[PDB]
Amino acid sequence: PIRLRELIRTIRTARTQAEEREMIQKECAAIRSSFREEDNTYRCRNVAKLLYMHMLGYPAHFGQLECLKLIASQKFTDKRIGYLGAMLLLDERQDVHLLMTNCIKNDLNHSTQFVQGLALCTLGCMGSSEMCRDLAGEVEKLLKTSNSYLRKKAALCAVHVIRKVPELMEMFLPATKNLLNEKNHGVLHTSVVLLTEMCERSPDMLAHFRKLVPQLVRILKNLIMSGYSPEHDVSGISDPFLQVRILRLLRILGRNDDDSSEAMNDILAQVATNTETSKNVGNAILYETVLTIMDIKSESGLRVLAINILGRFLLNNDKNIRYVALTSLLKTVQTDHNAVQRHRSTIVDCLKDLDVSIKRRAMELSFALVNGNNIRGMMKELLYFLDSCEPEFKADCASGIFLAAEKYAPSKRWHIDTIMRVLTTAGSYVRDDAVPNLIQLITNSVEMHAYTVQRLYKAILGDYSQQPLVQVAAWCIGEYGDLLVSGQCEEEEPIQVTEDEVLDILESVLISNMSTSVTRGYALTAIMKLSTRFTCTVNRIKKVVSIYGSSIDVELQQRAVEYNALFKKYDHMRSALLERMPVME
């Protein structure tokens, strides 16, 4: 019987990774040999060693039957070891917990409180779709018990069952009725959590659960009055978890009702001024109260107080406080949007903050705060942030700028210029999914094509390694070759488009090593469409199409062969299928 302490000391004594792995393998072999003999005396030490090995990163597939055997044992230590093994190495996807249902049911009626509590905790931690179905009746039976130490466990089991089985919440409707008078903090917290979970699962119980609003308000007032207590009094806040749960219930209770908001208005006003945010608990309580006020139909004074609190917390030098303030501002974006405009300077400064989370929150707030009047002004700031943004935020910044341009663009020309600048500066940071959106936006716009075509031609000849920019330029060329170059059928005066540079650029892109088979296909399609769109460069693309028909790629080879066949046998019918595609939202 090797003790867990001895195994830990041996593991600590190993230095090389290979030596530690060999020691772990020897220990696992010893454990498997002991289990194969059906050892029951030193099973606790073997279980502890197996748990340590699994936590260290060692396989434990063979150590599944031993845990099941120890679960159905009689020793308290053996029962605890089995419960720990089921919680750690037993899961719904493992499928080894199916045989544990009978053991749980047998232990569900066990007289010992620790065994029943351990079984309930294991069931809650390893809740399965089928285990909850066969254990739903047992959970409801213990929900009506008067055991304060077991009421919290029963509430947790019911919440886990509801989360795993949303259709099983109907059986808990009458079990929790008349349970708002629990003196114990744990029982009351469990009841409040169960009520909140039931309300969030379905809105049918909102009316039934909304009747207890005065009781919750009275309980919150009593808790606020009783600010001193040896239990739950940490950092000057007594029952901070209970206060947070009450605030969350108030925010989620009556979110679209006036009576519920009016009933809790006095409690929210008292809490907003009777709570000190000097400690972390107080700051968290203030943030929760502000969030509840914002998410509910609170009064104008409550909204003003929440805005002032958010502004004060924004100036706090604490990184956690700044992150909380940014999250609250982002959540209260649609609500109190005009009042959020007073923190534009703070939002801009948060982008340059030395916190990755703080910078992300500031960027999200700036993106959500873009309106139809500050979009033009904020465009320069967004471009500067994207140009000097982190590699993980450059793509996100470009996506946000594109979304803002497509949503609240002041004008098509300004939006087109911003999109072109983003594509030129984004380079490889432009998302490939945004390419179809940009193509659709370009197709929809039919008023700015000559300038856009010229810009696309200028940008394509400069660089071609940008897959999104290259694809956008190819699509624009294919769509508006007839407008990019005017009078390019024959030799003319020196202009931007001469009817030959575009073909050479397309050929280079198709043959360039910087092709992912998507830009090459777009270039081939544009070249094929340019046969009818452009009448200046003719009789030369047919040879390339015929040569391009023997490409290594099956799709590319088939496309080249089809293009060559169309050029050689359907020369007159080329224009019959070269019509412009329809434009739709």
Binding site: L4, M55, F76, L84, G186, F241
Partner: protein, 142 residues
């Protein structure tokens, strides 16, 4: 609820692990490695809050071993820090001058205390003395 709570050392060794979401073993190991890399590559002025995979990855280590949690974006961030501080205080009271070396030796006791404190990612014991008394009574049972 807290999707997963694990205790990891500064060097990367994990002293605790408790996930409330059923994930594949390879996927769980990859997630733990990514969390360790993010925490191991984070400064002291990052606010101790990270939104990784849409999860409130809050990292706050009061010693060489660090502590991390992952909860959904539906509650206040300070609540997680308060719960972590309360759990640390309860563990210190149960053990007495808790150190990194004692954590490895008392892995089973720490797991039992964590199970008795929080179950399924939700708070189960709001009071601090009641949980300690229950843990002591369970330990005295044998």
């Amino acid at each position: 609820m807290i999707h997963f709570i694990l205790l990891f050392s500064r060097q990367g060794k994990l002293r605790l692990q408790k996930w409330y979401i059923t994930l594949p073993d390879k996927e769980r190991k990859k997630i733990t490695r990514e969390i360790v890399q993010i925490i191991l590559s984070r400064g002291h002025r990052t606010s101790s809050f990270v939104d990784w995979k849409e999860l409130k990855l809050v990292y706050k280590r009061y010693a060489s071993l660090y502590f991390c949690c992952a909860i959904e974006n539906q509650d206040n961030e300070l609540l997680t820090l308060e719960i972590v501080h309360r759990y640390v205080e309860l563990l210190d009271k149960y053990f007495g001058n808790v150190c990194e070396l004692d954590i490895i030796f008392n892995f089973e006791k720490a797991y039992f205390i964590l199970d008795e404190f929080i179950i399924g990612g939700e708070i189960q014991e709001t009071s601090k003395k009641i949980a300690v008394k229950a843990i002591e009574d369970s330990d005295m049972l044998q």
